[PDB]
Each structure stands twice: as structure tokens, then as C-alpha cells.
């Protein structure tokens, strides 16, 4: 087949000018959509905060209006999903992943309204859920919509605009261009055969998406964490160890999120009303915990700067990790719209911090700043639960700009994904798509 290759090599990277242009517009819409969703999630979290001010004298009334405001929003968003788009529940990444396999529908007229307004319900109530799941589906569907609206035919155009839709949607969720591309190249692309996704296109969409984000968000960063110390070659081994703790814990957590999906189905059966009443109670729990114990509630980003700075007692860190392991599962496994990636950044920061504290006390000759181990553990659960180490490493790199930590970050990531593999664990997105495709047959 040497002659075919001479032919193909000479024809490489000639993406149709139409697919490039349409990737640009997908990028722009996904960016704008991201900002809009972002501004809304906050504005509701504000209204909720200001409510607790107009009634701040009477502490039971306090605990009540906290619970109920989030209960109401939770329900609305569960309902919005159960009623009009049940595949807009949970993450959204397995769905868009499935769609790239040509095995799941891009019901965009149904997901865009349901996912956007459903998330707003669950996110803005202070549930323990992320943006970057929803925005990855919301941006995947936007990518489909402009395929239909302009009726572009071709296999390339369908996988591409779905891919750059999803790419732009993660980039905008974390202000993380390089990390949005890599997610598609490492995790979302079909994993077992060739596919015809144009990478130059995906590049254009993320640029446009990111630039929309910078037009509505500049001067303020998602995680400011300073410049931390360096890492000495004789320190590296401490990170491979930290990795091996994530590699074992990642699959334990995957089990948990699956079984807790199974356990929480037995509570409502499928019954849209026991479901919507169940999310209202979960959401309200968040909205209450959001007041009496905010580290235990919410999306988690807020406390990443604080754990990294080593400003939590060991005692408070251990609390938070358990508590948020609980509220994380309760909120994501229940089926609400919203995701687990960004709260897995929090759980890993909190975990690596606590190791950093141990590792500082045990080795004064190393001159450790427990903050480097927080940065090494931030992308770690992403390497162990969802097995995309290259994305998290570059995700974390982009969000914390501490490139001197690249070797400990890499070394903890291999540790996470080597031990996650070696103790019998599966990519958490892929094990969700499959258990969903297995029900889409039984």
C-alpha cells in the first residue's frame, strides 16, 4: 500500500473551507452560550444570598429559606430534564461521547433549553455540580444545530462540528483553550477506530469560544494561587506516591458513583414526581449546608485557593474531603443536570493538600510547601476516575500557571492512571455510556 500513502501524505490537512468557517461560528455561539449560562448561575446564587439578608434575624427561618430556595430550583431543573430531555441529565459528556460514536441522538431542540435552564436550577441552588459538563453538551448540541441549520452533509462535518462544539464548550467553562482541545483528542474522540474529526477546525472553534469568554470575564481569574516553590529531583518520588494513592481511590469512587446511581433509583423507581421531590430535598440540603457549612456544599472552586495555601487545619481538610465525597455523590449520582469534573478538582486539591501537610512534617530536609502537593493532586482524580491524565494536567497547568510543577504533576498523573488501571477500574465516562447503551437494549 506504499502508493496509497504517497497519495494520502501529499493531500494531508486540507480541511474544507466550509467546515473551518462553520467551526468558527459554532465556537462563537458556544462561547456566548457559556457566558450566558455562567452569568445566570451566579445571579441566582446571589438572589439566594440576598434572600438570607432580608430575613437574617430569625435563625430557623434562615435554615428554612436556605433549604427551600434551593429545593425549588433543584426540582425545577430535575423536572425540566425528566419531562423534556432525560439524556440531558447528569453529566452530558457520555451523551456527546456516545454521539461521536453515532450511537446517541443529538436532540438539540430538547437539550439546549433543558440543559441550560436545568443546570441553572441545580447549579444556582448551590448543588455540588460543575459547569464544564453541561457546557460540553450544550456546546456539543450547538455544534449539531448549526450542522442542521446550514444542512452540512458529510461524515467529517457531523463529527467535527459535534467535536468542536464540545471542545469550545469546555474551553469556555474553565477559560482553558489548550485543555478543551486535548479533551477531544484524548478522551471524547471515538476510542477504537479511526474517525474524521478535523483538528484544525476544533482549533478555530476553541479560539472563538475562548475569546467570547474573555470579552465577558476579563481582569478576574478562576483560581488565583500565586507562584509556588519549585520541586527538587529528590522530591519527585513523593508525588509518584501521591499518585498511587489516587490510582487506588479513583476506582473506589467510580464504584461509589455507579452504585449510588443504582441505590438512588430504588428510591423513586422512575417516577417523575418522587424523583423531582427527591432532588428538591437533595438541593435543599445543599442550600442549607451552603449556609451552615459552605465547604461541604457548592461547586468547590472557592476553597481550592484556600487549601492550596495550606490555610485549612488537617482536621478541617479531612472533614471537607469526606463531606464533599458525600455531597458530591448525592448531587451527581441522583441524576440532576450538572457534572463531577470540577468538583473532582476540589476533591483532589483537598486530598493533595492533606498529603502535603503530612509530607512537610515528615521531611524538613526537603523544605516542602504543602501547596505543591495540592497542585499535584488537583488533576489527580481526573486521572484516576475518568482516566484523561493529559487533559487534567494541562487543565491544571492552564488554571494555575505553575509550570515549574510539571514533573510532579505528570508523575502524580501517571500514578493515578497506572494504579487506576492496575486495580481494575474503568474510564468513568465510558462506563456510563456503556451502562446506558446496555439499558438501550434490555
Amino acid at each position, epitope marked *: 500500500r506504499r502508493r496509497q500513502l504517497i497519495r494520502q501524505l501529499l493531500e494531508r490537512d486540507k480541511t474544507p473551507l466550509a467546515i473551518l468557517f462553520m467551526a468558527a461560528v459554532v465556537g462563537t455561539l458556544v462561547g456566548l452560550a457559556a457566558v450566558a449560562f455562567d452569568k445566570g448561575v451566579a445571579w441566582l446564587q446571589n438572589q439566594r444570598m440576598g434572600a438570607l439578608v432580608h430575613t437574617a434575624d430569625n435563625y430557623p427561618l434562615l435554615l428554612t429559606v436556605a433549604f427551600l430556595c434551593s429545593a425549588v430550583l433543584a426540582m425545577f431543573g430535575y423536572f425540566l430534564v425528566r419531562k423534556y430531555a432525560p439524556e440531558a441529565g447528569g453529566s452530558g459528556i457520555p451523551e456527546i461521547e456516545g454521539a461521536l460514536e453515532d450511537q446517541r441522538p443529538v436532540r438539540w431542540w430538547r437539550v439546549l433549553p433543558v440543559k441550560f435552564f436545568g443546570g441553572l436550577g441545580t447549579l444556582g441552588g448551590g448543588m455540588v455540580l460543575g459547569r464544564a459538563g453541561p457546557t460540553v453538551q450544550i456546546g456539543g448540541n450547538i455544534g449539531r444545530m448549526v450542522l442542521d441549520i446550514f444542512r452540512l452533509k458529510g461524515d467529517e462535518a457531523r463529527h467535527t462540528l459535534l467535536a468542536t462544539g464540545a471542545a469550545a464548550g469546555l474551553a469556555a467553562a474553565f477559560n482553558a483553550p489548550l485543555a478543551g482541545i486535548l479533551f477531544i483528542i484524548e478522551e471524547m474522540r471515538p476510542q477504537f477506530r479511526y474517525t474524521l474529526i478535523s483538528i484544525k477546525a476544533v482549533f478555530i472553534g476553541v479560539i472563538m469560544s475562548t475569546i467570547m469568554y474573555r470579552i465577558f470575564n476579563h481582569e478576574v481569574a478562576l483560581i488565583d494561587v500565586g*507562584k509556588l*516553590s519549585d520541586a*527538587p*529531583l*529528590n*522530591t519527585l518520588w513523593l508525588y509518584l506516591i501521591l499518585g498511587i494513592i489516587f490510582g487506588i481511590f479513583g476506582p473506589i469512587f467510580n464504584k461509589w458513583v455507579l452504585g449510588m446511581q443504582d441505590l438512588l433509583h430504588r428510591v423513586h423507581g422512575g417516577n417523575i414526581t418522587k424523583w423531582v421531590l427527591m432532588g428538591g430535598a437533595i438541593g435543599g440540603l445543599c442550600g442549607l449546608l451552603g449556609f451552615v457549612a459552605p465547604a461541604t456544599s457548592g461547586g468547590g472552586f472557592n476553597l481550592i485557593p484556600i487549601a492550596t495555601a*495550606g490555610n485549612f487545619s488537617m482536621g478541617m481538610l479531612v472533614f471537607i474531603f469526606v463531606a464533599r465525597v458525600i455531597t458530591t455523590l448525592l448531587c451527581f449520582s441522583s441524576g440532576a443536570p450538572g457534572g463531577i469534573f470540577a468538583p473532582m478538582l476540589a476533591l483532589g486539591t483537598v486530598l493533595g493538600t492533606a498529603f502535603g501537610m503530612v509530607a*512537610v512534617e515528615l*521531611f*524538613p*530536609q*526537603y*523544605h516542602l*510547601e504543602a501547596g505543591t502537593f495540592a497542585i499535584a493532586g488537583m488533576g489527580a482524580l481526573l486521572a484516576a476516575s475518568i482516566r484523561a491524565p493529559l487533559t487534567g494536567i494541562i487543565l491544571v497547568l492552564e488554571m494555575t500557571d505553575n509550570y515549574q510543577l510539571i514533573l510532579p504533576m505528570i508523575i502524580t498523573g501517571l500514578g493515578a492512571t497506572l494504579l487506576a488501571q492496575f486495580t481494575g477500574g474503568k474510564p468513568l465516562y465510558s462506563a456510563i455510556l456503556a451502562r446506558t447503551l446496555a439499558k438501550q437494549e434490555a
Partner: antibody, heavy 121, light 107 residues
């Protein structure tokens, strides 16, 4: 040029206290660890303690609760060592050092000329 | 803590002549460092990580060792090589120096 200039030594009466001062110039004095080493007349080198750039971890040699007070003022680009209840054992040349590493085993990178502290009534 | 004991407390050697002092550790030690002190001069880092010279340290200087015994060496000693050489360990904590070795010219 990288210059470490410690000052503040001299004659002090037994049981008193003094505050030595090392002024850094020629490098980002933040981001470096600083340390104190002293040399008793015709004797060995001896480590007093170290302070990390943010002042969140301060080590001292195995010695007495408030005997030494290392601290730093990154705005002033200056490091300080306080000696209290001054004995004759404390009569020594006091050296101010900046800390680094190689393969990660930490060494005493740049020293200053010294200041001498004499403890006599 | 770890006691380091430098061995020839004092010694002399003619210029262009082989010098070899010694460090020794009460417990086990990794990657020792070496400082060159002239009287009235700030102690200078001479040799670090058991073997790496420093910017300026002429090549006649070389250090060696493992585990519990280390050593400095000047293949051809000079006049300007007259000084005191202290070894120092931070392989454990806290870090300790040795007593010294005074290297004096011979004439």
C-alpha cells in the same frame, strides 16, 4: 551583584538582647529561604535557623523556646535575628545565608561577611 | 543529630601537589557540601552534591565519596588554595557542619 550585608553586632552585657540585621541586594530576596549560621571564636560552623519566603515555617537548632527569633521583612529586603538572655556562649561571628539546592539536598548558597557579637560586662 | 568530623585538622602541602582532606559521619549521609573560608572573607560554597564544582571553582578541585565517608581533593594545590574547608550535610535534618581543615602553604 548579589550582596548579603549583616549588621548590628557588637558589645552586649550578659543577659541582654540584640537584634541582628541582614540586608539583601542583587536578587529577588523573596522566593529564597534565608538562614543564620554563627562561628564562635576559633570554633566550628553552627546552624541557628531558617525562615521560608512567606514566614510560614521557621526552624531553629535544638535550643530554648524564645532564645532565637528569626523573622524577615520582604518589603525592606532584610532578614533579622534576635538573641535574648545573652550568654558568653553567644559571643560569635554571625553569618547570614541564602539557601538553595541541587539534586534537592540543600546547601548554603551565598554568605555575608559576618558581624561579630561580644558578650562581656 | 548527625556529627561530621573532618579529619586532618591542620595540614600543609607545597604548590603543585596533591591535597586530600576527609569528612566522616556519625550516621549515614548523602550529597555533602564544601565551603572555602579565608579569614576575613565570607565562607564560599566550593563543592556541592558530593561532586559538583561551582562557577569559578577551578578544575583542580574535586570531591568524592559515599554513604559514610566523603573527601575533597586538589590535584595540584596552589597558593590561593590556602584556606579552611568545612563540609556540611543536610541529607538529614537538622544540618550539621564539620570541624574544619586548615590548608596552609608549605615553604
Amino acid at each position: 551583584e548579589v550582596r548579603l550585608l549583616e549588621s548590628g553586632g557588637g558589645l552586649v552585657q550578659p543577659g541582654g538582647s540584640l537584634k541582628l540585621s541582614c540586608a539583601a541586594s542583587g536578587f529577588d530576596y523573596s522566593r529564597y529561604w534565608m538562614s543564620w549560621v554563627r562561628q564562635a571564636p576559633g570554633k566550628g560552623l553552627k546552624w541557628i535557623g531558617e525562615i521560608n519566603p512567606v514566614s510560614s515555617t521557621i526552624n531553629y537548632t535544638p535550643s530554648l523556646k524564645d532564645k532565637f527569633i528569626i523573622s524577615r521583612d520582604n518589603a525592606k529586603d532584610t532578614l533579622y535575628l534576635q538573641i535574648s538572655k545573652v550568654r558568653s556562649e553567644d559571643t560569635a561571628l554571625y553569618y547570614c545565608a541564602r539557601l538553595y539546592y541541587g539534586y534537592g539536598y540543600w546547601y548554603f548558597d551565598v554568605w555575608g561577611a559576618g558581624t561579630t557579637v561580644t558578650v562581656s560586662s | 543529630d548527625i556529627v561530621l568530623t573532618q579529619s586532618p585538622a591542620i595540614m600543609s602541602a607545597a604548590p603543585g601537589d596533591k591535597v586530600t582532606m576527609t569528612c566522616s559521619a556519625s550516621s549515614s549521609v548523602s550529597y555533602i557540601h564544601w565551603y572555602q573560608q579565608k579569614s576575613g572573607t565570607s565562607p564560599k560554597r566550593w563543592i556541592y552534591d558530593t561532586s559538583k564544582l561551582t562557577s569559578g571553582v577551578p578544575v583542580r578541585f574535586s570531591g568524592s565519596g559515599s554513604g559514610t565517608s566523603y573527601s575533597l581533593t586538589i590535584n595540584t594545590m596552589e597558593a590561593e588554595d590556602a584556606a579552611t574547608y568545612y563540609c556540611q550535610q543536610w541529607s538529614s535534618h537538622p544540618q550539621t557542619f564539620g570541624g574544619g581543615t586548615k590548608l596552609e602553604i608549605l615553604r
